[PDB]
Amino acid sequence: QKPGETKEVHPQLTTFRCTKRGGCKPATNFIVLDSLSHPIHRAEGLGPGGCGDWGNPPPKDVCPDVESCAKNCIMEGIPDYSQYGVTTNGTSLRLQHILPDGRVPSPRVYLLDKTKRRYEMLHLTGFEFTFDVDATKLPCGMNSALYLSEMHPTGAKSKYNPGGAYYGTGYCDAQCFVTPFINGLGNIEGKGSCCNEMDIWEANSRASHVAPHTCNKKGLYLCEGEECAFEGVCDKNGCGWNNYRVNVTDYYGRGEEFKVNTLKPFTVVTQFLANRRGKLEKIHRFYVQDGKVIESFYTNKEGVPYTNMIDDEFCEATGSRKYMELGATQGMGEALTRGMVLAMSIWWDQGGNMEWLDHGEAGPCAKGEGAPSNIVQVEPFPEVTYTNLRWGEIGSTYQE
Ligand SMILES: *[C@@H]1O[C@H](CO)[C@@H](O)[C@H](O)[C@H]1NC(C)=O
Ligand SMILES: *[C@@H]1O[C@H](CO)[C@@H](O)[C@H](O)[C@H]1NC(C)=O
């Protein structure tokens, strides 16, 4: 959609690039909300209305084709990100799910480079990504996410998408969702927005999930028909890594009887371990809390390969069929090597209550506990804070 006249004021976020020899050196980044989270309205001199909701093509009246859509639908800048529950403070990003005044912005943001006109492209195969988190205000059924998508570096800036990454265009993920704009262009044919997606962190105070998701396409792929479905071009489920799913129940939770005590802050380390040829083989997750390294659990479950890392053997074993079929750990590594955009969000699940994250085989949460009607009784204002985003050499990102 065409940029409007309102000023876009991106929050500044200091991050780090890490080496063994040089330590953690600070870098300037900016934060941008998803393009379709910006106010989108019909152009000056057109009757008021919308340019499409999540799940829909754009409207036939103002968007019969890409060129009409590009002039009739206006994306306004957001001059005050706090109205959408997005604030930064030095090296800290705070995402508020619900504001004090009752609004539910459920924000999703991307990391821009210091120009504000191109995503920071992370190339993590053979490297580590680390962050500090406060998960205390995330009950059952909340998802705090920190992940990568294979979005176009400029948000697919183009003649009819002049806004680009500066307005957060070009979002995609392994769900192949229909959005009224894809690559900042009217999705006239109502296709899905597919790409490789690496879920570094999907967690609340009750459960922690890591999951790579493969697609058999490079970059953002516009899917039609069966391509968007479970047997299509992307892996919707991913290869899930969660202590609970591998029958380890005392690793992560609220209080001193868990190794990672989600009542206090902690650090999350993710290593992308490659072979001599630069192909990804293992994803290693471990934590640091109160100045001490908490090594990963080993799997503890009959029929599951005994491992402390994600790899092809574990993924095949645990039923991740589309993950293996659409490129497996090597394919995921190739997307990570091409470069990905960092996305950070907070959301809840009216339909499923996020049961796949923290319920049953995945955690300690009862049926219905994760329903939004119950979340607000446990925590009226859910929020997450990510602090000191930092990536670089294996073993360089953490102290003690
Ligand atoms: C920034 O964070 C620190 C907590 O470290 C707090 O002292 C400070 O008041 C915060 N700044 C703003 C503007 O909220
Ligand atoms: C699950 O965990 C406990 C180990 O504490 C063990 O008794 C049980 O056999 C394990 N179950 C499976 C299905 O591996």
Residue numbers in the entry: 1 to 400
What sentences appear in the manuscript?
The catalytic actions of a variety of retaining β-1,4-glucanases contribute to the breakdown of lignocellulosic polysaccharides. Humicola insolens Cel7B (HiCel7B) was chosen as a model β-d-glucanase since it is well-characterized, has good hydrolytic performance with chromogenic substrates, can be readily crystallised, and has been studied in our lab previously.
Cyclophellitol is an inhibitor of β-d-glucosidases originally isolated from the Phellinus mushroom. Taking advantage of the catalytic machinery of a retaining glycoside hydrolase, this epoxide undergoes an acid-catalysed ring opening addition to form a non-hydrolysable ester in place of the normal glycosyl-enzyme intermediate, irreversibly inactivating the enzyme. Intact MS confirmed complete, single labelling after 60 minutes at 25 °C. Binding of the inhibitor had no significant impact on the structure of the active site, inducing no conformational change following addition to the catalytic nucleophile. This is in spite of the epoxide oxygen forming an extremely close (2.3 Å) contact with the general acid/base. Extending beyond the −2 subsite, in which essential hydrophobic stacking with W347 and hydrogen bonding interactions with R108, Y147, and S345 are formed, the active site broadens significantly, suggesting a lack of a specific −3 subsite, possibly accounting for the weak selectivity between 5 and 13.
